[PDB]
């Protein structure tokens, strides 16, 4: 796999979003991967609905957190609407999928990346954006303004985001905290070192949609 990958430059990443005062990161994370795989497979970049996952994936806990892989299975075994059709509200409400007409996109499944394995994660990223988790509770992550983030942090993951590229010293992550945080809403997290968990536990639990 090459030294640089950046799905933004291939038109496979939509603008940075803001989950606001709702623990819906898991839904944002899943949607980034869906937006990515749809562009790669069909040539169209669309925005898909985090709100639908928030309201409809009842294995997850709405604004109290949830599971990217559970969200991704919903899209494959049910489907997902466009963001325009089912926009983000920042509060969990009833599932309105039926009320909003047929799905816009469907996936053919979900796969997990081999955990605690930097190359496996990079190989996956070279193929498509990947949902990843990390520890975000530390002030260092919260206050990140730019540069290669090395921590300090532990491995107690609590935040779902999406990896959309990498380069020699980093993995490039799209966060859902608005465009003021980090590097225009992104973070470059240090990679390469002697760390099987990854910086901030980045290699703990990573998924991607399958299509088509």
């Amino acid at each position: 796999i090459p030294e640089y990958v950046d799905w933004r430059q291939k038109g496979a990443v939509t603008p940075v979003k803001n989950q606001g005062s709702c623990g819906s990161c898991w839904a944002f994370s899943a949607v980034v991967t869906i937006e990515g795989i749809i562009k790669i497979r069909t040539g169209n970049l669309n925005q898909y609905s985090e709100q639908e996952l928030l309201d409809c994936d009842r294995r997850s806990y709405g604004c109290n957190g949830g599971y990217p892989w559970s969200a991704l299975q919903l899209v494959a075994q049910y489907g997902i609407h466009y963001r325009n059709t089912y926009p983000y509200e920042g509060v969990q409400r009833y599932c309105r999928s039926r009320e909003k007409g047929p799905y816009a996109a469907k996936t053919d499944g979900v796969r997990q990346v081999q955990p605690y394995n930097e190359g496996a994660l990079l190989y996956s990223i070279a193929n498509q954006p990947v949902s990843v988790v990390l520890e975000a509770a530390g002030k260092d992550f919260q206050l990140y303004r730019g540069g290669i983030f090395v921590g300090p942090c532990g491995n107690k993951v609590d935040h779902a985001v999406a990896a959309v590229g990498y380069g020699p010293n980093y993995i490039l992550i799209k966060n859902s905290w608005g465009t003021g945080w980090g590097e225009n809403g992104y973070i470059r997290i240090k990679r390469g070192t002697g760390n099987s968990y990854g910086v901030c536990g980045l290699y703990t639990s990573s998924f991607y949609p399958v299509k088509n």
């Binding site: 989950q19 606001g20 005062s21 709702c22 623990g23 990161c25 898991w26 994370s29 957190g65 949830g66 599971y67 990217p68 988790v133 975000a136 509770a137 919260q142 993951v157 609590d158 935040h159 779902a160 905290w177 608005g178 945080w181 639990s205």
Partner: peptide, 5 residues
Amino acid sequence: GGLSL
């Protein structure tokens, strides 16, 4: 799994 800012 998974934070608000």
